[PDB]
Design an enzyme around this catalytic site. Structure first.
Site, PDB file in Angstrom:
ATOM      1  N   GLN A  93       0.841  -1.173   0.000  1.00 30.84           N
ATOM      2  CA  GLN A  93       0.000   0.000   0.000  1.00 30.84           C
ATOM      3  C   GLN A  93       0.909   1.267   0.000  1.00 30.84           C
ATOM      4  O   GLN A  93       1.884   1.338   0.771  1.00 30.84           O
ATOM      5  CB  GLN A  93      -0.874   0.022   1.263  1.00 30.84           C
ATOM      6  CG  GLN A  93      -1.627  -1.285   1.515  1.00 30.84           C
ATOM      7  CD  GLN A  93      -2.781  -1.335   0.586  1.00 30.84           C
ATOM      8  OE1 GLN A  93      -3.233  -0.289   0.107  1.00 30.84           O
ATOM      9  NE2 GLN A  93      -3.262  -2.541   0.281  1.00 30.84           N
ATOM     10  N   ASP A 132      -3.444 -15.781  -3.592  1.00 32.16           N
ATOM     11  CA  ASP A 132      -3.259 -14.767  -4.606  1.00 32.16           C
ATOM     12  C   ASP A 132      -2.674 -15.498  -5.824  1.00 32.16           C
ATOM     13  O   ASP A 132      -1.992 -16.529  -5.665  1.00 32.16           O
ATOM     14  CB  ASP A 132      -2.277 -13.707  -4.096  1.00 32.16           C
ATOM     15  CG  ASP A 132      -2.312 -12.420  -4.939  1.00 32.16           C
ATOM     16  OD1 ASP A 132      -1.716 -12.383  -6.052  1.00 32.16           O
ATOM     17  OD2 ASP A 132      -2.881 -11.420  -4.440  1.00 32.16           O
ATOM     18  N   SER A 133      -2.932 -14.992  -7.022  1.00 36.40           N
ATOM     19  CA  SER A 133      -2.434 -15.688  -8.229  1.00 36.40           C
ATOM     20  C   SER A 133      -0.974 -15.321  -8.500  1.00 36.40           C
ATOM     21  O   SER A 133      -0.295 -15.939  -9.336  1.00 36.40           O
ATOM     22  CB  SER A 133      -3.341 -15.337  -9.432  1.00 36.40           C
ATOM     23  OG  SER A 133      -3.339 -13.948  -9.703  1.00 36.40           O
ATOM     24  N   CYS A 161     -10.663   0.036  -4.352  1.00 36.74           N
ATOM     25  CA  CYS A 161     -10.538   1.470  -4.737  1.00 36.74           C
ATOM     26  C   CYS A 161     -11.309   1.744  -6.063  1.00 36.74           C
ATOM     27  O   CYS A 161     -11.128   2.778  -6.686  1.00 36.74           O
ATOM     28  CB  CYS A 161      -9.058   1.918  -4.852  1.00 36.74           C
ATOM     29  SG  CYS A 161      -8.257   1.158  -6.207  1.00 36.74           S
ATOM     30  N   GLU A 211     -10.315   4.530  -1.207  1.00 40.07           N
ATOM     31  CA  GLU A 211     -10.350   3.112  -0.837  1.00 40.07           C
ATOM     32  C   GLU A 211     -11.566   2.783   0.028  1.00 40.07           C
ATOM     33  O   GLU A 211     -11.671   3.250   1.150  1.00 40.07           O
ATOM     34  CB  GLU A 211      -9.113   2.749  -0.048  1.00 40.07           C
ATOM     35  CG  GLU A 211      -9.027   1.275   0.304  1.00 40.07           C
ATOM     36  CD  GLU A 211      -8.293   0.473  -0.756  1.00 40.07           C
ATOM     37  OE1 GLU A 211      -8.268   0.926  -1.917  1.00 40.07           O
ATOM     38  OE2 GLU A 211      -7.691  -0.570  -0.407  1.00 40.07           O
TER      39      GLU A 211
END
Ligand SMILES: Nc1ncnc2c1ncn2[C@@H]1O[C@H](CSCC[C@H](N)C(=O)O)[C@@H](O)[C@H]1O
Length: 392
Positions: free
Chosen positions: A239, A286-287, A354, A386
């Site tokens: 982030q 996660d990919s 977001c 966000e």
């Protein structure tokens, strides 16, 4: 072609009777000189500011007082979602940004304006004073080692970008020199930062990352959110607003329910790791393999027990969780994942986004209502926000 700007549209452009005007403020009294068409709309390309709005002071809203930026975001969210949403201010609105990618070119160091032209800068106030220091050292490095830099007209030259990262809560700084094939002079006598990286972009693409060639100092720096450390690598996402990131992980931890949590689209595990530190039982997916590797490294350095695995949203099981967190890419939630969530019905879904319009789209497809929702200004001086929604 004359009048007062009444509002901003969703991209932040002033609306004057259905012509658009960039970097204008509601209340501005303007004369439109030149118009241009951009996707079948009239856009004021040359205009005169006759009277300045009292709302005036990627940063397309930087000319606006911060309180008005937040008002614009409140109004935008209410338009898109259908109801009032609180917008939490960024704790800082200069110095908050923890990554900047500076192009290093024949005619200056900074960013593209008029894509063929560089805006040359001595500092980047949203990143903070470290950028001034890096820029000044960079100029010495380039000058004294006679380093070849990017000639944008010909796309030739060795040095392309200096990417600067820093941990706002740890004070560690990483600099990454992205170059073409070549030999980077020893940077150690020119920079004193915790980590110096040299990366070689071997693709034809103009990008500000490349293959890791060498580092000096720390292999990773860290950012810290409350008591949780996160490793930063030149090629890993984190982030960008560290100050709000603290509010974002706290907010997620507050909204989840139960003990068994799925951190879906975990990236490097921002939510999942924080939650594991708070005592939840966390699995994340996660990919992206590299992101998952970073998440596993984060588990290790924080001494928590959470598991991360590479999987696509097309295939991930949501069975057996008390809360599922989703932070999808721009495409939103895969339809198959929405079906699975509808069938399994975890007690709580926490949806972080977001992209308000994609969130709104996906929530209609889910067999859930919005129980609580807040927006966090992760992105001061831009139109972006966000959202964090708890769905039950
Ligand atoms: N089809 C897919 N299946 C699973 N993951 C995907 C995907 N498409 C994109 N992703 C991953 O979706 C994530 C959206 S960004 C998520 C950010 C993360 N929660 C964090 O806090 O850092 C990215 O990490 C990206 O690698």
């Amino acid at each position: 072609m004359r009048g007062v700007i009444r509002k901003l549209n969703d991209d932040g452009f002033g609306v004057l009777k259905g012509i658009l005007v960039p970097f204008s403020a509601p209340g501005d009294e303007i004369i439109v000189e030149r118009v241009e068409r951009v996707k079948k709309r009239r856009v004021a390309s040359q205009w005169k500011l006759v009277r300045s709005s009292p709302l005036r002071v990627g940063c397309t809203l930087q000319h606006l007082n911060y309180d008005y930026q937040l008002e614009f975001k409140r109004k935008k969210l209410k338009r898109i979602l259908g109801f009032e949403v609180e917008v939490v201010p960024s704790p800082k609105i200069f110095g908050h940004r923890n990554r900047i990618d500076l192009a290093i070119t024949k005619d200056g160091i900074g960013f593209r304006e008029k894509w063929w032209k560089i805006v040359d800068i001595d500092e980047c106030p949203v990143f903070g004073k470290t950028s001034r220091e890096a820029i000044e050292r960079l100029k010495e490095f380039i000058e004294e080692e006679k380093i070849s830099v990017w000639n944008i007209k010909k796309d030739e030259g060795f040095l392309r970008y200096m990417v600067l990262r820093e941990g706002k809560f740890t004070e560690e700084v990483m600099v990454n020199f992205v170059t073409k094939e070549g030999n980077l002079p020893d940077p150690t006598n020119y920079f004193d930062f915790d980590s110096i990286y040299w990366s070689v972009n071997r693709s034809k693409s103009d990008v500000s990352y490349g293959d890791i060639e060498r580092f000096w100092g720390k292999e990773f720096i860290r950012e810290r959110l409350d008591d949780v450390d996160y490793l930063i690598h030149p090629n890993s996402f984190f982030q960008t607003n560290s100050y709000q990131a603290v509010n974002l992980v706290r907010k997620v931890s507050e909204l989840v329910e139960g003990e068994k949590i799925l951190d879906m689209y975990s990236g490097v595990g921002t939510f999942g790791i924080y939650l594991a530190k708070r005592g939840f039982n966390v699995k994340g997916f996660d990919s992206n393999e590299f992101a998952i590797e970073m998440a596993r490294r984060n588990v290790e350095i924080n001494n928590v027990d959470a598991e991360f695995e590479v999987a696509s949203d097309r295939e991930v099981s949501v069975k057996g969780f008390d809360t599922v967190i989703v932070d999808p890419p721009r495409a939103g939630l895969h339809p198959r994942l929405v079906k699975r969530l509808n069938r399994e019905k975890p007690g709580v879904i926490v949806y972080v986004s977001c992209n308000p319009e994609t969130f709104a789209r996906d929530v209609k497809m889910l067999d859930y209502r919005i129980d609580e929702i807040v927006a966090l200004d992760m992105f001061p001086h831009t139109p972006h926000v966000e959202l964090v929604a708890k769905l039950v």
